[PDB]
Design a binder for this molecule. Structure first.
Ligand SMILES: Nc1ncnc2c1ncn2[C@@H]1O[C@H](COP(=O)(O)OP(=O)(O)OP(=O)(O)O)[C@@H](O)[C@H]1O
Lengths: 103, 109
């Protein structure tokens, strides 16, 4: 149900649609490596929707997590979750700038 | 080591070669293994250390090993390094206790 509205717009307008966003938090709680269960159903249902038989290019999905080496190995292939970045703790200049913005 | 690598690449019947480097503790074995591997050029190289099977459960370890071995059967050339073999099979000399399932899987693999 999270992709319905954006999809409707893509069908209506075309390539002139308005961007949609989907924020996922704690990606390491359900999406664990499928081995050889309810988890597999979840992983497959997401896989078939992120990039499936029907093209859909008016979306952008961000994901946030605390353990990056536990997501299944097929969810990190060029095309689905492409760019991976790291957030460090603030340094001294970061603290000064944070103080500047907050105060 | 170079000789063995060369044989494993260009041959016809030798399709599975193992090795076992043993010596006194602290002798610097893992570095030597990695060095022998790095000067081969094989497309696929992967490593299993206790540092990655850290804090997991036993069943998880078996599953992980299974997946690694499965991934090792889908490319023309491969290399594979394994460390300790008495630390993966948690060994404590009094009693003596250890875990049997992991050992049996490794012996079959
Ligand atoms: N041939 C070598 N020449 C120089 N230094 C070496 C050589 N082999 C290993 N070393 C040094 O050994 C150090 C790392 O030791 P290493 O982890 O390989 O030991 P180990 O035998 O695996 O130990 P342990 O039995 O305690 O697990 C590095 O500083 C590395 O440079």
């Amino acid at each position: 149900n999270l992709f319905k509205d954006a999809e409707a717009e893509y069908r209506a307008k075309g390539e002139e649609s308005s961007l949609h966003i989907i924020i996922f938090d704690e990606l390491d709680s359900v999406f664990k490596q499928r081995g050889s269960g309810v988890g597999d159903n979840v992983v497959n249902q997401l896989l078939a929707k992120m990039d499936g038989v029907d093209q859909l290019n008016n979306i952008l999905v961000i994901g946030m997590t605390n353990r990056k080496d536990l997501i299944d190995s097929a969810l990190l292939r060029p095309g689905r979750f492409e760019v991976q970045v790291e957030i460090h703790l603030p340094d001294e200049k970061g603290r000064l700038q944070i103080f500047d913005i907050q105060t | 080591g170079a000789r063995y690598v060369r044989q494993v690449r260009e041959s016809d019947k030798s399709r599975l070669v193992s090795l076992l480097i043993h010596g006194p503790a602290g002798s610097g074995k893992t570095a030597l293994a990695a060095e022998i591997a790095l000067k081969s050029g094989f497309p696929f190289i992967r490593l299993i250390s206790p540092n990655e099977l850290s804090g997991m459960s036993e069943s998880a370890k078996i599953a992980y090993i299974d997946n690694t071995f499965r991934d090792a059967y889908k490319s023309p050339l491969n290399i594979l390094v394994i460390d300790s073999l008495e630390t993966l099979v948690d060994w404590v000399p009094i009693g003596p206790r250890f875990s049997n399932n992991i050992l049996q899987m490794l012996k079959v693999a």
